[PDB]
Amino acid sequence: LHKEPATLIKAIDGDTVKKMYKGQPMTFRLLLVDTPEFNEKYGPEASAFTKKMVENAKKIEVEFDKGQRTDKYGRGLAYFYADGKMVNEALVRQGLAKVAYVYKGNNTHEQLLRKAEAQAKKEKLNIWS
Numbered sequence: 001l002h003k004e005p006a007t008l009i010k011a012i013d014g015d016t017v018k019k020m021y022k023g024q025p026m027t028f029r030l031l032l033v034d035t036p037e038f039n040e041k042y043g044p045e046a047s048a049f050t051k052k053m054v055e056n057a058k059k060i061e062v063e064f065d066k067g068q069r070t071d072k073y074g075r076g077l078a079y080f081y082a083d084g085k086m087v088n089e090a091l092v093r094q095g096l097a098k099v100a101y102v103y104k105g106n107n108t109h110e111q112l113l114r115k116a117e118a119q120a121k122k123e124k125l126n127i128w129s
């Protein structure tokens, strides 16, 4: 996979952001994760984590996987990086997202995320408390 520059417009919640992509404003959904909704326990924390991580970064990048780039709802599907650090992985490592929605063909970073999840579970951190 390769990274490319991202033009973010705003973070929406823990696992969705609004991005201009090829000149179209789109919602993008983070691959391989599930954060709580904004009004569920740890929802506000997951939203604030993703929001600060993308806003404080000098450089945001997006990385598509090998399979579909859009979901059935018209959302973009990608991994995001903020100054080189994967947002998808950071959320899982902090126990603010579960590994989820693992589809064959868009699963390149599955093992990396399951490693993070296991560390968060061992630490009984946030969602795993």
Ligand SMILES: Cc1cn([C@H]2C[C@H](OP(=O)(O)O)[C@@H](COP(=O)(O)O)O2)c(=O)[nH]c1=O
Residues within 6 Å of the ligand: 029, 030, 031, 032, 033, 034, 071, 072, 077, 101, 103, 106
């Ligand atoms: C992460 C992801 C979600 N989705 C779909 C599955 C769920 O659809 P259904 O609602 O039809 O079950 C929905 C979950 O998104 P949210 O977690 O944002 O609600 O988005 C994909 O199709 N591909 C993906 O890679």
Ligand SMILES: [Ca+2]
Residues within 6 Å of the ligand: 015, 034, 035, 036, 037
């Ligand atoms: Ca969610």
